[PDB]
Design a protein around this ligand. Structure first.
Ligand SMILES: O=C(O)/C=C/C(=O)O
Ligand SMILES: O=C(O)/C=C/C(=O)O
Ligand SMILES: O=C(O)/C=C/C(=O)O
Length: 295
C-alpha cells in the first residue's frame, strides 16, 4: 500500500553540481509533482539516505565548497510531519561516498572515504538509543559502494578500494557478525545504484575505471548468479536509486558530459526503462529514500 492517509514520495537529499548541495526535494509518482522542502543544515554530496520509522536519515557525505572540502560523519534526521532536520549522534569517522542499509530498524553505515583513507569499517546506528557502534569490518576497503538488504542480510557491492574499481561483493550475516564474499558481478562498478527488488539485488550504472555505465545486473540470492537486465537509457555514475511500489527509480548522476536531471523507472514485469520526470536541476551523488508525504 501507500498509507501514512498519505502517499509515499521519493526524497532526494543533497548532491553535487559545481559544489555540494543542500537541496531536499520530494517527487510524487502518483501525480508527477516535485516539492522543495527544508534544506539540509550542511551541504553534502556522496551521502546516503534511508528511512526508519517514517523518518528520513541523511548519512555521511562530504561538503565540497570553495570554503573548503570537509568529509562528513553526520547523521541527520528529517521529519516529514514537521519539515525540520534534526542532528543525531555522529559516526565514529567521516564517510564520503558511503553506502547504507537498514536491518531491523538499525542503520548500517558501510565504507566510504576520509581524505586519502578508504574504509572497510562498518558501524550500526540504534535510533532508540541515538548511538553508533562499530561492527565487523568488510573484507574489502570500499568507497562508492552500493548497499542493499535482502532477507535481513546486508550486501556491499562494488566500489573503489583506493587503487582498483571493484566487481566484488560481500554479504554481512548479523547473527554471526561476519562478512563473506559472494559471487562477483560481471562488471566492475564504483558509484553504482544498488537496491533490492523481489529476491534480487540490483546494481545499475556506475563507473568501471574508463566509462560511465548504463548496464544493469541483478544477483539472485537463490542461484548466486548475476544476470544482466535491460540497460538504462542513460549512462550514469553516482546515481541515486530507490524502489517505489515494485519499480526501481534512478535519479541523476554523471554521464561523462552532463550532471543529469533524468529520472528513469524500471518495470521488472516488462524489463523496460522509461523516463518518468526530471529533477529540478542536474546533480550527482544524492541520497534517496521513500517515506510519507510531508506537511
Ligand atoms: O565532485 C564530485 O562529487 C564528482 C564529480 C564527477 O563525478 O565528475
Ligand atoms: O523499521 C522501522 O522502524 C520502519 C521503517 C520504515 O519506515 O520503513
Ligand atoms: O571509482 C571512483 O573513484 C568514482 C566513481 C564514480 O564516479 O561514482
Amino acid at each position: 500500500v501507500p498509507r501514512g492517509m498519505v502517499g509515499r514520495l521519493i526524497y532526494t537529499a543533497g548532491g553535487y553540481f559545481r559544489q555540494s548541495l543542500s537541496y531536499l526535494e520530494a517527487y510524487n509518482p502518483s501525480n508527477g509533482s516535485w516539492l522543495r522542502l527544508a534544506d539540509l543544515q550542511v551541504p553534502r554530496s556522496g551521502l546516503a539516505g534511508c528511512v526508519v520509522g517514517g523518518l528520513l536519515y541523511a548519512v555521511g557525505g562530504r561538503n565540497n565548497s570553495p570554503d573548503g572540502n570537509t568529509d562528513s560523519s553526520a547523521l541527520d534526521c528529517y521529519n516529514p510531519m514537521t519539515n525540520q532536520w534534526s542532528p543525531c549522534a555522529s559516526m565514529s569517522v567521516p564517510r564520503n561516498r558511503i553506502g547504507v542499509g537498514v536491518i531491523d530498524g538499525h542503520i548500517y553505515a558501510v565504507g566510504g572515504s576520509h581524505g586519502c583513507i578508504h574504509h572497510s569499517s562498518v558501524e550500526r546506528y540504534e535510533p532508540e538509543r541515538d548511538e553508533w557502534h562499530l561492527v565487523a569490518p568488510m573484507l574489502t576497503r570500499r568507497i562508492g559502494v552500493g548497499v542493499a538488504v535482502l532477507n535481513r542480510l546486508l550486501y556491499a557491492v562494488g566500489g573503489f578500494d583506493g587503487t582498483n574499481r571493484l566487481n566484488s561483493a560481500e554479504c554481512y550475516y548479523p547473527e554471526r557478525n561476519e562478512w563473506r564474499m559472494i559471487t562477483p558481478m560481471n562488471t566492475i562498478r564504483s558509484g553504482a545504484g544498488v537496491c533490492v527488488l523481489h529476491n534480487c539485488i540490483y546494481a545499475a550504472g556506475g563507473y568501471d575505471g574508463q566509462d560511465q555505465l548504463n548496464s544493469v545486473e541483478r544477483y539472485d540470492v537463490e542461484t548466486e548468479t548475476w544476470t544482466f537486465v535491460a540497460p538504462m537509457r542513460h549512462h550514469r555514475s553516482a546515481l541515486g536509486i530507490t524502489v517505489h511500489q515494485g519499480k526501481i527509480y534512478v535519479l541523476g548522476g554523471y554521464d561523462g558530459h552532463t550532471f543529469l536531471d533524468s529520472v528513469e523507472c524500471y518495470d521488472p514485469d516488462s524489463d523496460t526503462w522509461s523516463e518518468v520526470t526530471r529533477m529540478t536541476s542536474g546533480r550527482s551523488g544524492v541520497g534517496v529514500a521513500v517515506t510519507m508525504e510531508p506537511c
